[PDB]
Amino acid sequence: DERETWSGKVDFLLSVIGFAVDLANVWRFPYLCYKNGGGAFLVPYGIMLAVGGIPLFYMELALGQHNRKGAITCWGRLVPLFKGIGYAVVLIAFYVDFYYNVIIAWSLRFFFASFTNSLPWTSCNNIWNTPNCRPFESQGFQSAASEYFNRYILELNRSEGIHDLGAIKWDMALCLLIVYLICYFSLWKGISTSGKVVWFTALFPYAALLILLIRGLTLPGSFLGIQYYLTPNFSAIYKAEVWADAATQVFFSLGPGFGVLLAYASYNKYHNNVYKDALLTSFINSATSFIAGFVIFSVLGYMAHTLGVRIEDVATEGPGLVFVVYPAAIATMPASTFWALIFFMMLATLGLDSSFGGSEAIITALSDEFPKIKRNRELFVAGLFSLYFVVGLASCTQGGFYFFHLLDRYAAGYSILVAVFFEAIAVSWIYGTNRFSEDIRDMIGFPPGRYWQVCWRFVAPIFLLFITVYLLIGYEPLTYADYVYPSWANALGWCIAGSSVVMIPAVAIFKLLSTPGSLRQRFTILTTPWRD
């Protein structure tokens, strides 16, 4: 039962760093600072990070290093009753792989489109333009970079909905194929290779962010953007919505209990100081977001100053920020081509390693439960990634964005919250904090302080619950621009969302009715950990 191990610590580290740090650090965090009181937003963010994210981040890492098994097997051994958690985590990782990768596909596309002396998204006098086009963002109009991304790259204008996918963009399907080719030849041999591919995919963003910080700061109006970014407004502290955005951001940006930190840590050495790893990584992740914030907003200010665009029209979130707003500014500065190529190469590498960790969560969680595939890795993941690409062709259609948007709002959003909720409950109340502290002490030599124990037991459930409730309060029937989804689209969405969580009681019911004795006796057995 002696499994493989990381061929060097840094591999594991960069793997965890890579997984944690993605486009969210760029296209979501700085917007939330802006929206919620600038520098003042760092307070609920920090506190939520200190008592919510990091404890959970830590917890899963320790669970990984301790049990030496993937999600399904680990949770099964931790608590036989709540083994379905492992399954719930694996399929969530499985669903996300269907849509998350297309973002990287868009990244490479722009990277290939930036091999020109004049970037194709500057002007409004192209074949794909409309009279509503203007050179930059403006209320009541569309921007040249928007119409490029929409009417040309996406050809979204030709779809009337999710029922009408339209034709297949073969320039896009190609990019998606390339993504999976990279994904395959990074993961097919396991951590012996992926532990090296992360040396590029996790380090390049810091190289890129650096020369972009420099380029962004040297631009006129940069300091104005810094003001929009971090001007304190402590009135936001009193707002519950700010604490909610802080909590949600911390959770999804660290991704604890997603079964990937678990997977990566399962390959660690038993007596490894995973505590230092949790702290170091967590910091680097948030530090990266902070850095990226200056990077984004220095350019945003330059736009609002030397291009005469309202700050309200440029300070956005999500793919709109990095596929439209930022390239729009890039194209106006000298050596535009250079900045364009590295910016796109960046958010490609920002996505790749995250995609690595997501898939590896699945493959690892499976090899530990089914020796059939552990013997046959390459074949399995070739079959898996092929399934990805085939279904992923739907994302490469003219209405591909509608498919992407549906999965992004249903597949993993709610499911992983109620999975990780049961994760915290099982660990801190069924398996016990005392037993967990004991495990950690055996590994790293010392037990967790009372701080971490109180957090895992009391703060963490309230944390996760405060978020789940929050996302449900602000629910709205799925829409995008003027396109409103049919009732059935939301129905199928909740099925995909529920196909995960349904594993929690389904297996609980299954293993309950699969053991002998009485009800109190069934529990006792399905409560006893594996080491017994």
Epitope: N434, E438, R441, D442, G445, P447
Partner: antibody, heavy 119, light 109 residues
Framework: EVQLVESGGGLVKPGGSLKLSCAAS????????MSWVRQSPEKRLEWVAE????????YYSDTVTGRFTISRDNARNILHLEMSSLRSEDTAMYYC????????????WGQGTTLTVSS | ENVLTQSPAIMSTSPGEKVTMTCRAS???????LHWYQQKSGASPKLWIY???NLASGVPARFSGSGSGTSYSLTISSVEAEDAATYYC?????????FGSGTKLEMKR
């Protein structure tokens, strides 16, 4: 406030069996890994066995493994050490010491109890 | 096992002297896992210097520890008469746990 008292111990012939005990008081006994450390008559310390706070992690020395059995009772606050196949080398002052944090060593030692293995 | 060897076995010292007893290991030990104990005559040992350099509570400032890898040492800046005891080094790095042969302080006259 913290107090450990070793009991048992005495004269035993080779192959004999005896069970040592250590009563703890002044702290949450169920939160600290306990350890038996013996001291030969030439005033030389030798670690015997360690038991985790929940008894789910046991470690023995080479000269003791397979013969001694360390045990815990978190209900009545008692560290146990059942010995069997006692050889003359086992003759020592057996100390009950606690060591939860490996990076801090044994912060508290009992008064000790004497075991003599002779024919 | 990782055998710790302490020298000197017996050390003769008059109060006011600066002394240094050494603790050598057969295998490398992490600086946070090597500890020192003091044992008076007819008494149970007490934790003296944990994690190489850190003094345990009640331990006077005249005591200190240093070293790394396979070579550590306890130093008494200015010996007092009350420091007449035996000092044992111990590693908590790997199992089985091992103590040093010990070094005994004796007074001169």
């Amino acid at each position: 406030e913290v107090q450990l008292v070793e009991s048992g111990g005495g004269l035993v012939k080779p192959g004999g069996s005896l069970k040592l005990s250590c009563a703890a008081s002044g702290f949450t006994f169920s939160s600290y890994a306990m350890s038996w450390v013996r001291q030969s008559p030439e005033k030389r310390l030798e670690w015997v066995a360690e038991i985790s706070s929940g008894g789910r992690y046991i470690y023995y020395s080479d000269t003791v493994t397979g013969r001694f059995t360390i045990s815990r009772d978190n209900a009545r606050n008692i560290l146990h050490l059942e010995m069997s196949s006692l050889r003359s080398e086992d003759t020592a002052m057996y100390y009950c010491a606690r060591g939860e944090v490996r990076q801090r060593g044994f912060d508290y030692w009992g008064q000790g109890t004497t075991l003599t293995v002779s024919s | 096992e990782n055998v710790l060897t302490q020298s000197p076995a017996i050390m003769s010292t008059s109060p006011g002297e600066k002394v240094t007893m050494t603790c050598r290991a057969s295998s490398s030990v992490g600086s946070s896992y090597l500890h020192w104990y003091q044992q008076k005559s007819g008494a149970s040992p007490k934790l003296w210097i944990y994690s190489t350099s850190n003094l345990a509570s009640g331990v006077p400032a005249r005591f200190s520890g240093s070293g790394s890898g396979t070579s550590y040492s306890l130093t008494i800046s200015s010996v007092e008469a009350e420091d007449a005891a035996t000092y044992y080094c111990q590693q908590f790095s790997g199992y089985p746990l091992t103590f040093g042969s010990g070094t005994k302080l004796e007074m001169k006259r």
